[PDB]
Amino acid sequence: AKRIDAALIVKDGRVVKGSNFENLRDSGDPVELGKFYSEIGIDELSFWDITASVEKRKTMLELVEKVAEQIDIPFTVGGGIHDFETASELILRGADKVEINTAAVENPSLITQIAQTFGSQAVVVYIAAKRVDGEFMVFTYSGEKNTGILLRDWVVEVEKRGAGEIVLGSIDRLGTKSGYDTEMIRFVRPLTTLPIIAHRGAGKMEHFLEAFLAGADAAKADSVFHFREIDVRELKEYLKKHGVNVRL
Structure with missing residues (x-):
């Protein structure tokens, strides 16, 4: 199966520039957005943190803890992971993968x-x-x-x-x-x-x-999904129609 990933660019615990899903409580909440995405047909999530510290280490560790509790699909964290100890922390906290x-x-x-x-x-x-x-x-x-x-x-x-x-x-x-x-x-x-x-x-x-x-x-992709230029379900149907093996 070919996999569709949504990337969420994240700052101080916020989706940077939010989303257009007005059906959600908080459209800049990355845990609510990621969960919504896992329910509409996104296969994996990426969170990229651009927190300009000094609250970064903690903001990231809290994000994954919070994501790990709620979401049942694979996720990656990245954004300034520079050494083993930083990776270890994030994974031990519930990130499935780290991006370096x-x-x-x-x-x-x-x-x-x-x-x-x-x-x-x-x-x-x-x-x-x-x-x-x-x-x-x-x-x-x-x-x-x-x-x-x-x-x-x-x-x-x-x-x-x-x-x-x-x-x-x-x-x-x-x-x-x-x-x-x-x-x-x-x-x-x-x-x-x-x-x-x-x-x-x-x-x-x-x-x-x-x-x-x-x-x-x-x-x-990111804003294309967040700003609803491409609907994830429409995308997967289109791909499946044309011979691509995607999990529908």
């Missing part, structure tokens, strides 16, 4: 440490990549640092260190609603046996179809 990016590049052993303790399934490595002069290049630090590492090298190393899946984010699709980067998905597919999660570019139902054709095991 920059920390993973500056310490590929961190992947292995999380995987050796909690299982590979608990390690999501977000790979943010961009076209640089003919090459797919890996960028760190909210896409600000050109690491010099080739996408093809990093993917192999990510699997080799024991990551359970890869969120493949196209910096070239940041803020666009014109499609997922299917060329980047097709580039990576033969290189890894891990699940590939497409992120950045979604604007319409057809885009999801394209990403799965390209070899994505999952497709993640």
Whole structure:
């Protein structure tokens, strides 16, 4: 089964810019939004925390505790997870998976440490990549640092260190609603046996179809769902109609 993920960008315990589901008590409540999503056909949730501390560590730990109590589908936490101890805390508190990016590049052993303790399934490595002069290049630090590492090298190393899946984010699709980067998905597919999660570019139902054709095991989106540009049920019906094996 191909998987549909909703990403919720979270700040001080709030969904950043809320949602359009007026049927909910509190549309900026991420635990109520995530729960609603799990009931309408979202397969997995991501929470990305952008709390500019010093309340971050605690806001995140409270979020997952609260999410873990209410929601019956898999979830990931990310947003500033920089070391083993931070990952350990979040998982021991009820996160199923942790998402790491920059920390993973500056310490590929961190992947292995999380995987050796909690299982590979608990390690999501977000790979943010961009076209640089003919090459797919890996960028760190909210896409600000050109690491010099080739996408093809990093993917192999990510699997080799024991990551359970890869969120493949196209910096070239940041803020666009014109499609997922299917060329980047097709580039990576033969290189890894891990699940590939497409992120950045979604604007319409057809885009999801394209990403799965390209070899994505999952497709993640955010505001497109939160602002009701795409209905999750309509999406899954559309995908199923066209030969995609989604849990309806």
